[PDB]
């Protein structure tokens, strides 16, 4: 894997853009400016092995950098990344962890530290499938907890049903790992979206298998719970993307 | 009251610029050969130490001329009267192209800028309403970023209008589509693809083959390019039905 380049530049910049013109009616300013974000980000992982972390390293990166979030608005997601962010709207309905500060400036980028100067690899990093699972996952599980942590009143989750080998909710998943559990009492309802991809075989249907599972896990936590599957809103999305499956039939 | 300029111009331009070299639509629409600082200063000069409404069409044409990128074959789209649903349709680039998804668009897309005569040369608490200032003072960004943008697209082009207003027609020459981007379409264009919005339970204003549209159809002809007009097609319908699921035109 190759890192980003400029890797300082594309940060600060992301910031920069970020703090003056982004999500301004949305998500609130944080109180640190770029270059202090930048030094709790870098000193994260710079001067080290490039597999020397934890779930630790980035507490102060997103101590400093986290957001008050919108009431009802947190969206969760697996397996349906690209539909769950077209729903999401960049901020028109939901929010998601890629309308965040931390969320926005690093998402897709590609870094990692070494031991000698200048304390990080601008040319070859580790194929994280190499790490042991906490420094894979120290980034966006220190991420999506954080996120999680911030979510006040309804939270929506968005699954995938149409996969014959990975179940709609997995324990052992980003959100089953690191979301869920940091769910504060600020949160009183998990509105779950199923997902049934057109064309495709239907595999997980609300109440039954690894949904039923979520179901009883998200009711002995105090919280509220719904779930549906293809609703309206979300059908018509897909469909733009395929209008003559058959799912997409209109009347005469 | 009173109209407020962007906070920290080079900050942010530098910001995005940096950003989207490095980053954004890498797979979609090639880089610049100019470096970013290259860019601000062809960009400054335009208005810098000027009276904010001392500016023309040529102004900014060597920022243009830096900025401009080669666009790639059949995806470029045009839109009046209908930004949002353009842009959700054209899927960040992935469908079609607007102007917002190349380098000059997105670095200065909904930012606000004048000059002054005293240093520093650009006026950072308050700029004139532009219909303050002359027809070529008050376009001469955003005209010059559409004939530029206009002017290199190649194969056919796309173009969404609205159908739905009662006071605006469709096509007017009078737009910035008419003004600046219809007439300065090179020879490398084979065809005009019309798509026409009808808003969902609103009166139906405009059709295919009448109307200011029927105006469209011959000057487009008469430019020797193809012509087709298409309304409300399933691709775009299926979009405006996501948002309203409930309208007589998304019944199942
Ligand atoms: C936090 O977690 C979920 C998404 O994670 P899940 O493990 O539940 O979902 P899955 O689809 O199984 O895994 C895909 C992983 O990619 C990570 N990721 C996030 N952002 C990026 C970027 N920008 N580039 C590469 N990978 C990224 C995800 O966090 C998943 O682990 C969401 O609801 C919350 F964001
Ligand atoms: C070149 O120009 C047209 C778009 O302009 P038109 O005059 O043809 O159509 P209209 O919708 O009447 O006005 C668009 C111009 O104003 C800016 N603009 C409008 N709405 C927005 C929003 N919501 N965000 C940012 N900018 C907006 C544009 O800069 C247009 O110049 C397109 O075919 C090509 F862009």
């Not at 910049?13 to 949305?26: F, M």
């Not at 690191?178 to 239907?202: A, C, F, M, S």
Request: proline fraction near 6%; charged fraction near 25%.
């Amino acid at each position: 894997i190759v890192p980003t380049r400029e890797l300082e530049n594309v940060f600060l910049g992301r910031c920069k853009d970020y703090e003056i013109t982004r999500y301004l009616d949305i998500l609130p300013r944080v109180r640190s400016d770029c270059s202090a974000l930048w030094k709790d980000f870098f000193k994260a992982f710079s001067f080290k092995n490039p597999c020397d972390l934890d779930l630790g390293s980035y507490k102060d990166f997103f101590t400093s950098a986290q957001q008050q979030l919108p009431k009802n608005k947190v969206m969760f997601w697996s397996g349906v990344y690209d539909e769950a962010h077209d729903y999401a709207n960049t901020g028109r309905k939901y929010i998601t962890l890629e309308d965040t500060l931390p969320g926005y400036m690093l998402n897709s980028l590609v870094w990692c530290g070494q031991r000698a100067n200048p304390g990080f690899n601008e040319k070859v990093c580790p194929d994280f499938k190499t790490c042991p699972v906490q420094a894979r996952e120290s980034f966006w599980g220190m991420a999506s907890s954080s996120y999680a942590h911030s979510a006040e009143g309804e939270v929506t989750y968005m699954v995938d049903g149409s996969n014959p080998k990975v179940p709609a909710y997995r324990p052992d998943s980003f959100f089953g790992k690191y979301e869920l559990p940091n769910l504060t009492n600020k949160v009183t309802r998990v509105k779950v979206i199923v997902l049934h991809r057109l064309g495709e075989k239907i595999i997980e249907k609300c109440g039954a298998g690894s949904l039923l599972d979520l179901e009883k896990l998200v009711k002995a936590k105090h919280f509220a719970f719904d779930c549906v599957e293809n609703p309206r809103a979300v059908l018509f999305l897909l469909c733009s993307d395929n209008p003559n499956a058959r799912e997409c039939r209109l009347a005469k």
